[PDB]
Amino acid sequence: GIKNIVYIEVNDINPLNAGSYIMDDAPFFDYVILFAANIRGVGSDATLYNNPNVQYILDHKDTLIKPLQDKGIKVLLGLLGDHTGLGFANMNSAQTEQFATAVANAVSQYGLDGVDFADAWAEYGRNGYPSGSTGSFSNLITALHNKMPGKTITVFNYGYTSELTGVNSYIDYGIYAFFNSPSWSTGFGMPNSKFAPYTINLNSAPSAASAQLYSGQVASKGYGAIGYYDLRANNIVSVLNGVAKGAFKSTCTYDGNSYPKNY
């Protein structure tokens, strides 16, 4: 049961567009990631910051999130560094529990299905924060798991993720971080059934022939997911139908609904 996991840049793209692709009377995509809320060091606090676009979607969850979940799509909050020098991987123990508390609170408050960690753009070490890893990234996954054990946690395989092997039982999926070409390996010791070794950039899209070939390999090699980054509001069905044929022996169709970002 390969899962299709798509990241949506909510600064540009209305997440409802993920619901416009259909394969076998179900949404093509199984997980939608609202990319992204940020971790921000503010003095000695580790903070969760939702920019106006993220916060608008969360404030309008009944119209911008719930319709996806009503279709059976799991909707996750993306988490990304934001240039303050503090990131997932250089926190002390107090900051780790602060950030875990903030994230779990966001998931419960907005009725989300989980979170995705993308350890990018933290600019580790700026503003007096540690320049290297403190080992906090593994403790953060454990803290968050303990606060919300039935919710999904995915990890984009970028940054300090190599440290996560000891905690990987708490991680549902890992996603390969480079686009349009598979790497037949996994990060942080994940089994193949919990990894996407192939991640399609839906903005700078590959050919449908490359998507069908590589997705068929994802399936025949027993991997459990395929990643998709930057679904836009155009009709990208030729690529997704390539995957449907390759990985799912099926087809994917587009319903024509291009949802605007008018907020």
CATH architecture of 3-254: Alpha-Beta Barrel (3.20)
191 neighbors 213 (Cβ within 8 angstroms): no
Residue 255: which of 100, 15, 27 has the closest Cα? Answer: 27
Residue ranges of alpha helices (H) inside the chain are 52-59, 61-64, 66-70, 93-109, 136-147, 208-220, 237-248
Q: How far is the C-alpha of 129 from the C-alpha of 257, rounded, in Å?
A: 45
Distance (Å, whole) CA 258 – CA 106? 28
Nearest in space to 117 (alpha carbons), one of 192, 184, 170: 170
State the Cα–Cα distance between residues 232 and 15, nearest whole angstrom: 9
CA distances from 151 to 75, 146, 242 (A): 10, 10, 31
Which resolution in angstroms does this entry have? 2.1
Q: How far is CA 58 from CA 47, 163, 169, in A?
A: 17, 31, 28
Please tell me whether the peptide bond between 36 and the residue prior to it is cis, using omega within 30 degrees of 0: yes
Residues 6+ away with beta carbon under 8 Å from 117: 79, 88, 141, 153, 154, 155, 156, 161
Place of tokens 């949802």: 259
* Domain residue spans of the chain: 3-254
In sequence order, which residues have a C-beta less than 8 Å from that of residue 129 and are 6 or more positions away?
A: 41, 84, 85, 86, 90
Using CA atoms, how far apart are residues 154 and 106, in angstroms rounded to an integer? 16
Q: How was this structure determined?
A: X-ray
